[PDB]
Write a protein that binds this ligand. Structure first.
Ligand code: A1ATW
Ligand SMILES: OC[C@H]1O[C@@](CO)(O[C@H]2O[C@H](CO)[C@@H](O)[C@H](O)[C@H]2O)[C@@H](O)[C@@H]1O
Ligand SMILES: OC[C@H]1O[C@@](CO)(O[C@H]2O[C@H](CO)[C@@H](O)[C@H](O)[C@H]2O)[C@@H](O)[C@@H]1O
Ligand SMILES: OC[C@H]1O[C@@](CO)(O[C@H]2O[C@H](CO)[C@@H](O)[C@H](O)[C@H]2O)[C@@H](O)[C@@H]1O
Ligand SMILES: OC[C@H]1O[C@@](CO)(O[C@H]2O[C@H](CO)[C@@H](O)[C@H](O)[C@H]2O)[C@@H](O)[C@@H]1O
Ligand SMILES: OC[C@H]1O[C@@](CO)(O[C@H]2O[C@H](CO)[C@@H](O)[C@H](O)[C@H]2O)[C@@H](O)[C@@H]1O
Length: 468
């Protein structure tokens, strides 16, 4: 018997819905799928659909009806999806598919990807004021999972994350950024599962490790929530008492791990927080040393960027918190993974499905305290055959780090699939995510992207639903 949705959440939700009702309805993004055993035949189907869609009868059919009909075809080896708001975009996109040409709304491949997708759970640097709000108001499944995490977090820390999502006046801090991005991560992944997708493996960075543990079957939703709540509040409370000589900055520098080993001989107190990309590393330490290594970087033409925090996670400054984190996590129950795990806590090494559990109290201490081996995990995934990396986040920050490691590992055409992004319609974005999973042959029931038909006008007069 968990807490319910707070009264203030409901209040904020009613105001938000009026805000939504009084806005101009935008044309939805529809996925149009064509496929064939042969790419040559796929291109002809795309040309035939474009022709019919140019005809008066095609023009008279809604995109949603056309796409619902396409979704009931057999789905062949060679695939394409044209994402469209109207008949113009669709016909344009289909002509590109027919012509073998690239367009920004078009995905087309000769055959499925060989290995299943890696779900990427990062989070840092992805937050913004209204993250998750639009999809909450507009997707029943997304909203159900948000509320499930909101009840658990309510019960664990005593406040409502859903109030933060719904109230535009409020913005996120070191604590609430983590628990709220977690909630968005859980809800995005369960929405994806709802339409048939699943992770082949998971990889986490810093914040996202708790969600990655849930989706890998290493911890119940309750214990994953305990993992992100204890981490988050200790970090925010600890960092707020940091002043003067106790302050520790974090910064991004264009140095590799090997460069760092040599550059750090001038900086005794600097530590590595995150190995982000082959030539991007996040360091932490006392402000004067951080300022000097930044100065050193910019003098060598390398770029460098100070983050906004008075404390540095994944350094020794976390040693005061570990005792309390240990106490708060007593009772969690680590379970055997149900998909692969690239563990950026354990130096980037792989854990097979059915392996021994890894997510014990010591795992969360080690993760908070020690470096995040993100680029090593990604490289390990590339080297064992993975090419599709799907990021669950309000903004696709980590995907840019993945691109750097995949290109550097020789993979020059990875499938980098984002989810949400500020200033992209959150329902469009999720359509596009699931349309890509389909093109590459990953698990996804494209039929579930369209509501159940309730009448013959929900179909179009094309195969497989031609009217007798
Ligand atoms: S944990 O507590 O959440 O700690 C943690 C994890 C990950 C972090 O870094 C994420 C990150 C990153 F690795 C790189 C960038 N990035 C690349 N390029 C730029 N901008 S610039 C100066 O080239 O124009 N920024 C950003 C980012 F958030 C940090 C802490
Ligand atoms: O939602 C827009 C509109 O609603 C008002 C109340 O009429 O404020 C509601 O929404 C705000 C944004 O989330 C909240 O901060 C506020 O608490 C809530 O009452 C208007 O002030 C606003 O223009
Ligand atoms: O501890 C002395 C030792 O560390 C250096 C490294 O640059 O400085 C740091 O330690 C000081 C405390 O003694 C701090 O005041 C300072 O913020 C920190 O960078 C040198 O002073 C020396 O090699
Ligand atoms: O501030 C100077 C410092 O910045 C760098 C880039 O990190 O250069 C920029 O500033 C110079 C002065 O305006 C410009 O001439 C240069 O084109 C610009 O990139 C460093 O090279 C320099 O040390
Ligand atoms: O102030 C640094 C800035 O000055 C330039 C010349 O505009 O370089 C000078 O300073 C360097 C030391 O930082 C010397 O190595 C160099 O010989 C001298 O010309 C810029 O190149 C630099 O960004
Ligand atoms: O080829 C089968 C393979 O395709 C996916 C999507 O990548 O599912 C499609 O094919 C199914 C029929 O085999 C349809 O039920 C489904 O609607 C369609 O997306 C994968 O999920 C499936 O393994």
């Amino acid at each position: 018997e968990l807490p319910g949705v707070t009264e203030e959440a409901l209040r904020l939700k009613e105001a938000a819905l009026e805000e939504l009702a009084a806005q101009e309805v935008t044309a939805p993004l529809v996925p149009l799928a064509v496929s064939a055993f042969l790419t040559s035949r796929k291109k002809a189907a795309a040309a035939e659909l474009a022709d019919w869609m140019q005809s008066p009868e095609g023009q008279a059919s809604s995109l949603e009806s056309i796409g619902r009909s396409l979704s009931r075809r057999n789905h062949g080896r060679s695939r394409a999806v044209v994402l469209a708001h109207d008949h113009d975009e669709a016909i344009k996109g289909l002509r590109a598919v027919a012509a073998g040409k690239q367009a920004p709304n078009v995905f087309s491949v000769d055959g499925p990807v060989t290995t299943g997708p890696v779900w990427v759970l990062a989070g840092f640097g992805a937050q913004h004021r209204k993250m998750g709000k639009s999809l909450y108001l507009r997707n029943e499944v997304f909203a159900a999972w948000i509320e499930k995490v909101d009840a658990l977090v309510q019960d664990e820390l005593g406040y409502s994350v859903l109030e933060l999502i719904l109230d535009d006046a409020q913005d996120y801090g070191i604590e609430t950024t983590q628990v709220t991005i977690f909630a968005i991560q859980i809800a995005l992944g369960e929405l994806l599962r709802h339409h048939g997708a699943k992770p082949a493996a998971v990889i986490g960075q810093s914040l996202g490790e708790a969600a990655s543990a849930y989706f890998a079957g290493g911890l119940s939703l309750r214990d994953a929530t305990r993992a992100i709540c204890s981490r988050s509040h200790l970090m925010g409370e600890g960092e707020a008492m940091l002043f003067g000589e106790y302050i520790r900055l974090m910064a991004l520098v264009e140095y590799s791990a090997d460069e760092i080993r040599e550059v750090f001989s001038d900086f005794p107190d600097l530590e590595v927080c995150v190995y982000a990309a082959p030539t991007q590393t996040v360091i932490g330490g006392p402000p004067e040393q951080v300022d000097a290594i930044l100065a050193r970087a910019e003098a060598e033409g390398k770029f460098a960027r100070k983050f906004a925090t008075k404390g540095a996670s994944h350094t020794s400054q976390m040693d005061p918190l570990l005792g309390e984190l240990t106490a708060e996590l007593q009772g969690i129950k680590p379970t055997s993974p149900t998909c692969g795990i690239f563990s950026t806590v354990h130096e980037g090494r792989y854990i097979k499905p059915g392996g021994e559990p890894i997510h014990d109290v010591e795992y969360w201490k080690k993760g908070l305290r020690h470096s995040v081996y993100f680029t090593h995990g990604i490289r390990n995934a590339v080297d064992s055959g993975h090419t599709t990396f799907l990021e669950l986040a309000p903004n696709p920050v980590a995907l840019m780090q993945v691109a750097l490691t995949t290109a550097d590992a020789g993979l020059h055409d990875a499938q980098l699939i984002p989810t949400l992004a500020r200033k992209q319609d959150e329902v469009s974005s999720m359509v596009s995510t699931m349309a890509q999973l389909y093109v590459y042959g990953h698990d996804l029931d494209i039929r579930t992207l369209f509501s159940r038909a309730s009448g013959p006008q929900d179909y179009a007069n094309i195969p497989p639903t031609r009217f007798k």
